[PDB]
Amino acid sequence: VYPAQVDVAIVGSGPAGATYARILSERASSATIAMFEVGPTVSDPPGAHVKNIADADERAHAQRRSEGPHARSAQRRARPGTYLLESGYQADGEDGLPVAAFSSNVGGMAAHWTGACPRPNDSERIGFLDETGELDELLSEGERLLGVTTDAFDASPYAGIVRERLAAVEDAHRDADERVQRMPLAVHRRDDGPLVWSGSDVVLGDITRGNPNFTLFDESLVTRVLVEDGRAAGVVVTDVRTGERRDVRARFVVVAADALRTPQLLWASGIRPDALGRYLNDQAQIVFAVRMRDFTPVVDADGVPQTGLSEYTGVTWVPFTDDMPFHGQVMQLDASPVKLADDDPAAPGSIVGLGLFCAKDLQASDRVAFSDSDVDGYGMPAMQLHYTLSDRDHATIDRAKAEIVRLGKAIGDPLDDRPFVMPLGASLHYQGTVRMGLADDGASVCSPDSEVWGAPGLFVAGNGVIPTATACNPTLTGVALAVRGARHIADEITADLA
């Protein structure tokens, strides 16, 4: 049932592919757009967060259906809704990324995420985009695409307690962009009431869902980018249910398949610039849990809602600075990406999690490589992950450990006297494998318009495009770069009237 040809073909249905779809439905409403996603549709509207599902059985089922090719080792475990590499996650003598993870479903990982959307600060910021002022406009556009808000928790009885206690011990030398503040969150209220995380449902929006020139094929594996006469020419799509392959022609191909499957697809298609898969970076994650002190109990608590989130302390943001190079977030437990502790039923909302994230010392040898012979559960070239912590990595991680204890003691009594360094890959923030650069000099995969050097008309999208060393949650930034790329494709299409 696939089209013979469309104008733009998008592989991937998380916020990056969705960003391209929505921006072209806005600025290029005349263009036909096909989106191919290998995973099933597990939520309504497609791409919506699993916490929209009220029945616990159905919700657990949506999660299990997102967990990869085998979905129809107790010491190396994936969070629900994601799956790990079965092998190739670590080479001899290397740290590797033991819990590098993926999601395969409409909505991508954003059907399962915890929605935190900070802006990059200081050296995390892409400078050639920051100098023109365009970076701020792109980040504003991404906040619009994700419906990002800071106020979602401002009415709860515990509003501001965590922010107050942190501000008490925060250096009087930081300015507004750097002081303790609310986390900006990709969250919205359901018409029936409950707060819930926002994903590709929100990025796609009613403008994409109502666009008669747009189509979404779930359970559709892209095995190849068709290149012809120098340019991107289309995609090869396998219907996962019947197994038949078909070519879809396209003047534009956007690959937003996450930071490791996007290089996978490009390698399988013979598009192999030297930077492809290289400069891969995860954000080492340190976690901590504390019981808040001096906690006025609420006389008539609501009892956890059957969809969406509870409203306890919310999420606070402790911003990255060059001088203090960790992204910090303090979270009520149902907003943490990692199970840290159980809430006290005697005092709901009093146990809070903390996570600090480090910036990686970027290395050429930190990469994802691919096999000529072996294949994964989708029949795509199998990955081998090469990843080493430098001494600078270890030094900054030790700093993060001391700082997370200092921040947690300011809030309450720690559940443990020392924090925990999560296994590498646990942050689920993988950047750099298809990084943008100013010039085709071998050190980048794509241009500032996200177009890959040497394959005009081929575009890349997601956290893999971020070329800098970052600590903060990357999705907002990946979506912002997607905004620039999709605007460029719209420019090209409207100009095609020549």
Does 14 interact with ligand FAD (rule: CB under 6 A)?
yes
Q: Which helix (H) or strand (E) holds 255?
A: strand 252-255
Q: Smallest distance, Å, CB 463 to ligand FAD? A: 5
Contact 467, 432 (CB under 8 A): yes
CB of 230 to ligand FAD, least distance (A): 23
**Whether residue 488 lies in the annotated active site:** no
Closest separation in Å from C-beta 188 to ligand FAD: 15
| Among 20-28, 105-113, 140-148, 274-282, the segment contacting ligand FAD (CB under 6 A) | 105-113
Beta pairing partners, 235: 225, 248
Residue 143 backbone phi and psi in degrees, to 5: -60, -35
- Residue 259 beta carbon to ligand FAD: minimum distance, rounded to whole angstroms: 7
The reply to whether 203 sits near ligand FAD by the rule CB under 6 A is: no
Closest to ligand FAD by CB, 43 or 114: 114
Residue list for the binding site for FAD: 37, 103, 105, 109, 114, 116, 222, 463, 475
According to CB under 6 A, which one of 8, 11, 426, 460 is a site residue for ligand FAD? Answer: 11
Which residues lie below 8 Å from residue 397, measured CB to CB, with a gap of 6+?
284, 286, 358, 389, 421
Which DSSP string do the residues of 373-412 spell out, in sequence order? EEE-TTSSEEEEEE----HHHHHHHHHHHHHHHHHHHTTE
For ligand FAD, give the closer residue by CB, 80 or 414: 80
| Nearer to ligand FAD among residue 467 and residue 474 (C-beta) | 474
Chain discontinuities in the chain, listed by preceding residue (C to N exceeding 2.5 Å): 72
Under 8 Å between Cβ of 213 and 232: no
Q: Which stretch binds ligand FAD (CB under 6 A): 1-9, 35-43, 90-98, 148-156?
A: 35-43
Listed ranges 92-100, 113-121, 348-356, 435-443: which one lies at the site for ligand FAD (CB under 6 A):
113-121
Query: Quick one: 17 or 348, whose CB is closer to ligand FAD?
Result: 17
Q: Which 279-338 positions form the footprint of ligand FAD (CB under 6 A)? A: 337
Per-residue x/- mask for ligand FAD, residues 216 to 235, rule CB under 6 A?
A: -----xx-------------
Residue 491: its H or E element: helix 475-495
Q: Which of 109, 271, 280, 404 binds ligand FAD (CB under 6 A)?
A: 109
The active-site residue out of 112, 327, 386, 429 is 429
Phi and psi (nearest 5°) for 491?
Answer: -50, -50
Question: Contact region for ligand FAD (CB under 6 A) — 100-108, 286-294, 414-422, 431-439?
Answer: 100-108
Whole-number Å distance between alpha carbons of 208 and 82 = 26
The answer to whether residue 240 forms part of the interface with ligand FAD (CB under 6 A) is: no
CA 387 to chain centroid: 20
Site size for ligand FAD, by CB under 6 A? 39
Annotated binding residues, as ranges? Answer: 37, 103, 105, 109, 114, 116, 222, 463, 475
Of the candidate spans 12-20, 128-136, 316-324, 345-353, the one that interacts with ligand FAD by CB under 6 A turns out to be 12-20
Specify the pairing of strand 101-102 against strand 148-149.
Answer: unpaired
Would you say 268 and 368 are in contact if contact means Cβ atoms under 8 Å apart?
no
Q: Which helix (H) or strand (E) element contains residue 145?
A: helix 134-146
**Angstrom distance (rounded) from CA 62 to CA 109:** 12
| Overall size of the chain counted in residues | 498
Q: Which of residues 390-429 bind ligand FAD (CB under 6 A)?
A: 428
Please pick, from the candidates 180, 256, 352, 455, the single residue that binds ligand FAD as defined by CB under 6 A.
256
CB of 289 to ligand FAD, least distance (A): 17
Cis peptide before 45 (omega within 30 of 0): yes
480 Cβ contact list (under 8 Å, min separation 6): 135, 138, 139, 141, 142
* Pairwise CA distance, residues 466 & 489, whole Å: 19
Task: Give the shortest CB-137-to-ligand FAD separation in angstroms.
Answer: 20
Let me know: does 351 contact 342? Beta carbons within 8 Å. Answer: yes
Question: Residues 367, 475, 489, 493: which binds ligand FAD (CB under 6 A)?
Answer: 475
| DSSP-derived 3-state class of residue 303 | coil
User: Which of the 8 DSSP states describes residue 5?
Assistant: B
Q: Which residues are catalytic?
A: 429
Residues near ligand FAD, by CB under 6 A = 11-17, 36-39, 79, 82, 103-105, 108-110, 112-116, 221-222, 256-258, 261, 265, 337, 428, 462-463, 473-475, 478
